[PDB]
């Protein structure tokens, strides 16, 4: 009933689309993704996201973070993240496996620009990693 190949292609196209659309926001491309910044360790940045449950909890945290930033572009990107999380639930249903389901304000208030630019470049990295491992037999 549900064609899985269409879902993989739509997943790839939406990921590539969100990364390029966010890629049009010029000030983030010149910011080093791998440079470590003390204080934003709660943001699930590059730290092996090697399981379906880790991807799900990562996108859940990212959703919770994006929900508090008042930009419209990020709100739709968050909507795409919602479609993506529901899609990852559908993919786990395809492979058969169950999926279960604060300090942000302080850094948002004291340093919003740094927090946003890093959070966004880390989001781009998370999507690039999931993509780079969405073919090496992803497992729940």
């Amino acid at each position: 009933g549900v064609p899985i190949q269409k879902v993989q292609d739509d997943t790839k196209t939406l990921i590539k689309t969100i990364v390029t659309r966010i890629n049009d926001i010029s000030h983030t491309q010149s910011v080093s993704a791998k440079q470590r910044v003390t204080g934003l360790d709660f943001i699930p940045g590059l730290h092996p996201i090697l399981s379906l449950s880790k991807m799900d909890q990562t996108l859940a945290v990212y959703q919770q973070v994006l929900t508090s930033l008042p930009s419209q572009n990020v709100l739709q990107i968050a909507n795409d993240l919602e479609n993506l999380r529901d899609l990852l639930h559908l993919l786990a249903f395809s492979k058969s496996c169950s999926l279960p389901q604060e300090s942000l304000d302080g850094v948002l208030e004291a340093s919003l620009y740094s927090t946003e630019v890093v959070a966004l470049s880390r989001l781009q990295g998370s999507l690039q990693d999931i993509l780079q491992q969405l073919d090496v037999s992803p497992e729940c």
């Binding site: 939406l14 590539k16 739709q76 909507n79 795409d80 479609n83 529901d86």
Partner: protein, 593 residues
């Protein structure tokens, strides 16, 4: 003690069911049981009383032409309650003639059954006396007639056809009659086309969704409510277009284009919208086939931006360059239209199938005129729209390459024969776009003498140049210099008196083919000097002006001259043979035209 019940109401259903309702006492914190008494003032007066725990009661088989009166009282269900006072009675009266059902709304291929209890002079005639007529025009065949009972007449339509609208009558109005005695009562059978094509477009920023749709067929029924109903299912659309039970209405407004257009904003992008047009008609609700869409699949393809159309130097192609729009992200087909600039344009079209190609080269008949080019793009799979044609792109007039063949030039003599220093007016013509390619920037006449060697003087854009020839021999080569260089193939013409007396033509004659055409015949002598070509010089005889020359190959014997010939004037045909060393003596004849 509880208060008396209030809000008494009564209604009659289609089949003949008597529904009695009353408002429950919410102020009472206890359940209430209601004693309801009804007095049926029918042809025989009856009275009854019942006790019901609920707030509704049913009395089946409503008698035609009969009155009904209802009164209600209430009492506490639990405990030693006290019966409340009786409420206000309600009285109602019924009607005679019956249809089952009054009307039917359906589509093609249905099995519509109709019945009528037909009253003739207060008597229900037999079902064999009831005859059904389609719009009082053609009797319905009795094969479709059926006998539910003697007093109920039945007609049936299996595998219905589309009830084609007759004027404002989209339905069929069946009349059941006492044979030739027809009442005014009729039953309406509707078949309505609902197939509407909806075009939806997602904005160029991925924030809002805009849908347009044309109610082309539905502009035939009025008084009913026509609206779009959408339901958002979490992911994508169901593989079978279906109606989810829960749905919401969408506010949409008609615009001057004839399409209802409305916007969802902000958007839930892969979150499927199943919409369809519901039409609350008097008979029910006609529903268009539920069409579900994923908005991401109907994004607008923007007209491609920053297209430059120019001329490729040294190749003569039409180069077009562009960039992909912001959206979409799938592969794209591209269409290009191009033509010569002007009020009228002959549009040539080409298509590109690979999205990686951001540049293209094209062939065009004209190489050096202003060109207008416009671009559009669509999704390669076509699941979308064709973009608006881009803004016009104008090429710049630049030379493709150096010219190929040089201009043909000849000499005009001014001065006395004994006066050696004579004015030679070199006269040529501008090259064609095949020789000059795009244009000739300037003309350079390079001279050659045994004294001054080889030297050149720049002429400008003029095709005439008068220079004082003094030496016994003087060579001239005219070069057409474009923005890149001079013409490749060029002709050299030498002027020299001593061998200007050299003969090369034996016989020459002319014949007036017409006032516009003349044939020139000549036989040549064996040439000792290398005869490159000839120059026919024709002018009005016994005059100075009217001087016109044409170059002729030396390898031919026949020629045709076309001009506005003047038949009164004899014309001096002066065929000048041209050699490698210089110009030979002309063969001069005189002949009418």
């Amino acid at each position: 003690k509880p208060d008396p019940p209030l809000g008494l109401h009564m209604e009659v259903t289609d089949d003949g069911n008597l529904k009695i309702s009353w408002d429950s006492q919410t102020m009472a914190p206890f359940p209430l049981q209601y004693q309801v008494k009804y007095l049926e003032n029918s042809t025989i007066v009856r009275e009854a009383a019942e006790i019901v725990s609920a707030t509704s009661l049913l009395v089946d088989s409503v008698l035609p032409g009969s009155s009904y009166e209802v009164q209600v009282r209430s009492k506490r269900l639990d405990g030693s309650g006290v019966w409340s006072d009786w409420s206000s009675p309600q009285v109602f009266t019924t009607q005679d003639v019956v249809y089952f059902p009054p009307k039917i709304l359906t589509s093609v291929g249905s099995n519509a059954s109709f019945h009528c209890i037909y009253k003739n002079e207060n008597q229900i005639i037999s079902s064999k006396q009831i005859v059904w007529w389609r719009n009082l025009a053609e009797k319905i065949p009795e094969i479709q007639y059926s006998i539910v009972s003697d007093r109920v007449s039945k007609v049936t339509f299996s595998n219905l056809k589309a009830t084609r609208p007759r004027g404002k009558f989209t339905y069929d109005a069946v009349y059941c009659c006492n044979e030739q005695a027809c009442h005014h009562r009729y039953a309406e059978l509707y078949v309505i086309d609902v197939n509407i094509n909806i075009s939806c477009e997602t904005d160029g920023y991925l924030t809002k969704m805009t849908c347009r749709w044309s109610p082309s067929t539905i502009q035939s029924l009025v008084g009913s409510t026509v609206q779009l109903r959408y339901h958002r299912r979490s992911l994508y659309c169901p593989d079978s277009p279906s109606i989810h039970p829960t749905s919401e209405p969408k506010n949409c407004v008609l615009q001057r284009d004839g399409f209802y257009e409305c916007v969802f904003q902000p958007i839930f992008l892969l979150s499927g919208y199943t919409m369809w047009i519901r039409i609350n008609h008097s008979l029910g609700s006609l529903d268009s086939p539920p069409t579900c869409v994923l908005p991401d699949s109907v994004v607008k393809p923007l007209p491609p931006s920053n297209v430059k159309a120019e001329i490729t130097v040294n190749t003569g192609l039409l180069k077009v360059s562009w960039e992909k729009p912001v959206f979409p992200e799938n592969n794209l087909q591209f269409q290009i239209r191009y033509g010569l600039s002007g009020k009228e344009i002959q549009w040539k079209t080409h298509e590109v199938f690979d999205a990686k190609s951001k540049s293209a080269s094209l062939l065009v008949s004209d190489l050096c005129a202003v060109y207008v080019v416009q671009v559009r793009c669509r999704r390669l799979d076509g699941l979308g729209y064709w973009s608006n044609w881009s803004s016009p792109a104008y090429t710049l007039v630049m030379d493709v390459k150096v010219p190929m063949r040089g201009p043909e030039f000849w000499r005009k003599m001014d001065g006395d024969v004994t006066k050696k220093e004579r004015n030679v007016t070199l006269l040529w013509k501008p090259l064609t776009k095949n020789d000059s390619l795009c244009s000739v920037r300037r003309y350079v006449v390079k001279h050659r003498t045994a004294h001054n060697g080889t030297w050149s003087e720049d002429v400008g854009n003029r095709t005439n140049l008068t220079f004082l020839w003094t030496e016994p021999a003087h060579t001239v080569t005219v070069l057409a210099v474009n923005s890149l260089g001079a013409s490749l193939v060029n002709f050299n013409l030498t002027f020299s008196w001593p061998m200007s007396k050299v003969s090369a033509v034996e016989s020459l004659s002319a014949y007036p083919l017409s006032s516009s055409c003349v044939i020139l015949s000549w036989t040549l002598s064996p040439d000792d000097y290398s005869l490159l070509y000839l120059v026919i010089e024709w002018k009005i005889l016994n005059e100075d002006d009217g001087m016109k020359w044409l170059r002729i190959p030396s390898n031919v014997k026949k020629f045709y001259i076309h001009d506005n010939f003047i038949p009164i004037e004899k014309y001096q045909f002066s065929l000048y043979p041209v050699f490698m060393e210089g110009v030979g003596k002309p063969k001069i004849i005189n002949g009418f035209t």
